[PDB]
């Protein structure tokens, strides 16, 4: 943390943090949410790391070079050590991206290494070459050499995920899926994990071996799992809480803001709240349907009426602040509502459904307050406006999320945020093989648009081509866009080092300090 001149510390350096949810896990190639990342980032630190404003900055590798785009060189810090005082060295890299890229892992981010395009990537995923072809290689302890199929200009924008971050082979290979517990985890962030008690918290501890340590301020940080938004206000009111974590909710916002308006912090975000379509079930597979869904929900209402909050109606999946997104905001946007309800009971109307044979499904939610008065009040509009009955279904976290993957589902209730600000970070979500494809969306011509993109060297051509793999997705009625995010939490008057200046929102607890209050 960089401490001001004159700003007067607390004599204790404790910090608590809401962070929504209990963790899937806390090994980097198990996790893809924000709270799994937000602990993440404090434990495992991998070649860059975002600094308070978000850039793009040194982590364990000091200096890097790239030559042409396609091979990066890594010059890993010689003081960079683990938790328990052994050295982090580009062995521990190459063990770990090859672990994320090896099937077996079955890592939630595997197709991270083909976003990176990092040479091999596709047989590995597909078990036709072993995980330790991949393009990766030690050239010595402190120097890690990474080679792509082809050139790839912000490559180390996406090094900073936790996807990315190394693991400790020893302690892995000793201890399997246990390795993470407190009496057997190797870490080598800012901090080191004190305790785990799951739904109930997680406790951090200041990492003495950090290379860093020295500027590291907050000595313990706790992170708790609180879905419910309400609970996380009421006792960040209640002066237990430091930070609540990023989801607000309903009942309270607007009162919040007149009560506390210096505590409320509202800054850009780059992630997109929608309503994901499962694409390869029956009847969400045709057009018909995902269209009329997409047309119906009002987002004025629940952008402006139900929520509130500064959100922005979505049109697209990426972000159009995303750098480098160009976006063409599409006819059906511009119109009424009244004639986007018309377009959708007249394409429902073709699809076969009618009074006496409606359309009647699921809607999938993660637990929260918010998402379960955005869902009633989605039921509603979609009610009223397409007469559609939908049964509500609210799961944990984790649960969630494997459904999701599974595809045991008909729409769930979704929010993608950005790992790297580019708009891939967001559309490779939506190639047929990613990992990540929880829409369950194979498009042949969408997958063509976007590996298009990397075969010219012109920003204006790939600015294009991604307005057009949007336009594609549109089309299709991939996904039902709701409404931008932004990052709205509470923060206390003590709390420095909050910027809110990076709009991925890749908060490291060494950058934060306690002033005396
Ligand atoms: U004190
Ligand atoms: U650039
Ligand atoms: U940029
Ligand atoms: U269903
Ligand atoms: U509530
Ligand atoms: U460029
Ligand atoms: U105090
Ligand atoms: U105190």
């Not at 799992?225 to 609540?244: A, C, F, K, L, Q």
């Not at 209402?301 to 509130?308: D, E, F, G, R």
């Not at 998402?371 to 559609?388: C, E, F, R, T």
């Not at 498009?443 to 060297?457: E, G, H, N, R, Y």
Request: with cysteine; hydrophobic share 35%.
């Amino acid at each position: 943390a960089d401490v001001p001149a004159g700003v007067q510390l607390a004599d204790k350096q404790t910090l608590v943090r809401n962070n929504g949810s209990e963790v899937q896990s806390l090994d980097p190639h198990k996790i893809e949410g924000v709270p799994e990342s937000n602990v993440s980032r404090d434990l495992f630190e991998g070649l860059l790391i975002s600094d308070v404003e978000g850039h793009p900055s040194p982590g364990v590798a000091e200096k890097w070079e790239n030559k042409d785009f396609k091979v990066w060189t890594f010059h890993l810090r010689e003081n960079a050590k683990w938790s328990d005082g052994t050295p982090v060295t580009a062995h521990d890299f190459v063990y770990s991206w090859q672990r994320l890229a090896d099937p077996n892992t079955a890592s939630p981010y595997a197709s991270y290494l083909q976003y990176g395009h990092i040479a091999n990537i596709d047989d590995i995923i597909a078990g036709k070459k072993p995980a330790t072809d991949l393009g990766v290689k030690a050239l010595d302890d402190h120097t890690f050499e990474v080679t792509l199929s082809e050139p790839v200009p912000y490559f180390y924008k996406l090094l900073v995920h936790p996807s990315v971050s190394p693991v400790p082979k020893s302690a892995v290979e000793k201890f399997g899926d246990k390795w993470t517990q407190p009496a057997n985890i190797v870490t080598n962030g800012a901090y080191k994990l004190k305790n785990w008690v799951v739904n109930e918290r997680i406790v951090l501890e200041r990492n003495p071996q950090y290379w860093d340590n020295a500027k590291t301020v907050i000595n313990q940080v706790t992170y708790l799992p609180i879905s419910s938004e309400v609970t996380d206000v009421n006792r960040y009111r209640s002066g237990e809480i430091d930070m609540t974590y990023n989801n607000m909710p309903i009942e309270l916002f607007q009162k919040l803001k007149k009560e506390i308006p210096n505590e409320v912090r509202v800054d850009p975000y780059l992630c997109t709240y929608y309503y994901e379509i499962n694409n390869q079930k029956a009847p969400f597979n045709d057009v018909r349907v995902r269209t009329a869904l997409k047309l119906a929900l009002d987002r004025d209402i629940i952008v402006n009426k139900v929520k509130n909050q500064g959100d922005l109606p979505a049109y697209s999946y990426t972000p159009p602040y995303t750098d480098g997104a160009k976006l063409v905001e599409p006819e059906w946007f511009k119109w009424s509502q009244q004639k986007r309800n018309e377009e959708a009971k007249k394409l429902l109307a073709e699809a076969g459904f009618t009074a006496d044979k409606p359309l009647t499904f699921d809607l999938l939610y993660n637990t929260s307050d918010l998402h379960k008065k955005l869902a009633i009040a989605v039921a509603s509009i979609w009610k009223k406006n397409l007469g559609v009955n939908v049964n509500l279904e609210n799961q944990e976290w984790k649960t969630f999320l494997d459904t999701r993957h599974q595809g045991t589902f008909d729409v769930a209730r979704a929010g993608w945020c950005a790992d790297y600000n580019e708009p891939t970070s967001f559309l490779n979500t939506m190639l047929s093989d990613s990992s990540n494809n929880t829409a369950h969306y194979k498009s042949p011509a969408f997958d063509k648009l976007i590996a298009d993109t990397l075969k010219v060297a012109d920003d204006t051509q790939r600015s294009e081509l991604y307005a057009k793999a949007e336009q594609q997705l549109d089309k299709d009625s991939a996904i039902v866009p709701v409404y931008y995010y932004v990052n709205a939490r509470l923060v206390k008057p003590w709390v420095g080092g909050y910027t809110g200046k990076d709009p991925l929102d890749n908060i490291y607890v060494k950058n934060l300090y306690i002033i005396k209050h």
